[PDB]
């Protein structure tokens, strides 16, 4: 039902090895559709989904111009942040920015976001009202003062509520086959002895889209969350995702253990059993 458009930007300083590395990617939901890499030969925003390829030369020219403008902004930021934190010339540092919009099942605006991190920690974020800022430390307060005086939130709000939502609808429409699909997980459990008295029970979900999923183990109906090993949801490489959850149990107790799968493609949550 619900959809998102998000752009992700990463800039990394490399002191005495030239200019910072800048990478930008754009996603609709869990499907990537554009990239820019500062180190690549093309110096162009490039398509990474079949359905964006139909956009004409104005789009590619304008996206390339805007992405380079974003890059230059982060180039300046790396210098400014080194000053705010009294950091030395030599060490590598990382700025990240993410922004975009969520829409509901009816494709109307739900939420907007515009968040920044420095060296892996929250730095400054646009609040839910898109009128004010959350600044994570004293250096980010300096940025908040400058962004309040420059009316930054007002310019961001118009994009996030309007333009972002308009283009997300266009992409959803043009990529309908890919983007407005739901692939329910194909599920099973595997059993393997680890000794003569214990077995690994691993619950699998394969071939699903979108990536959001919940896999849980119960013992006699009680959640086993501290005893569960749950791996990160991972891409199969074909546009679908995979995940597993495992528990190690005493041999003979298999029938007490059930795996539970929730996904938007399932007409009902599934319970998998060993009997």
């Amino acid at each position: 039902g619900s959809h998102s458009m998000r752009y992700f930007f990463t800039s990394v300083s490399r002191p005495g090895r030239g200019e910072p590395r800048f990478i930008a990617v754009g996603y609709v939901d869990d499907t990537q559709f554009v990239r820019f890499d500062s180190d690549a030969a093309s110096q162009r925003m490039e398509p990474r989904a079949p359905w964006i390829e139909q956009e004409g030369p104005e789009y590619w020219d304008g996206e390339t111009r805007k992405v380079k403008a974003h890059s230059q902004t982060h180039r300046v930021d790396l210098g400014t942040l080194r000053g705010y934190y009294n950091q030395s010339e030599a060490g590598s540092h990382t700025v990240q920015r993410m922004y975009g919009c969520d829409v509901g099942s009816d494709w109307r605006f739900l939420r907007g976001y515009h968040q920044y991190a420095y060296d892996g920690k929250d730095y400054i974020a646009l609040k839910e009202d898109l009128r004010s800022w959350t600044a994570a430390d004293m250096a980010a307060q300096t940025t908040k003062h400058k962004w309040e005086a420059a009316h930054v939130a007002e310019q961001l709000r118009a994009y996030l509520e309007g333009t972002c939502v308009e283009w997300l609808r266009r992409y959803l429409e043009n990529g309908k086959e890919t983007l407005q699909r739901t692939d329910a997980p194909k599920t099973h459990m595997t059993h393997h002895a680890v000794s003569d008295h214990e077995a690994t029970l691993r619950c699998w979900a394969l071939s699903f889209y979108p990536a959001e999923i919940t896999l849980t183990w119960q013992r006699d109906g009680e959640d086993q969350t501290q005893d569960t090993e749950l791996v990160e949801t991972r891409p199969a490489g074909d546009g679908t995702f995979q995940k597993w959850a495992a528990v190690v149990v005493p041999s003979g107790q298999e029938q007490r253990y059930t795996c539970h799968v929730q996904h938007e493609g399932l007409p009902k949550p599934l319970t998998l059993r060993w009997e």
Binding site: Y7, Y116, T143, W167
Partner: peptide, 7 residues
């Protein structure tokens, strides 16, 4: 499409 900022 991308968004008109420095810290």
């Amino acid at each position: 499409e991308l968004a008109x900022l420095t810290v």
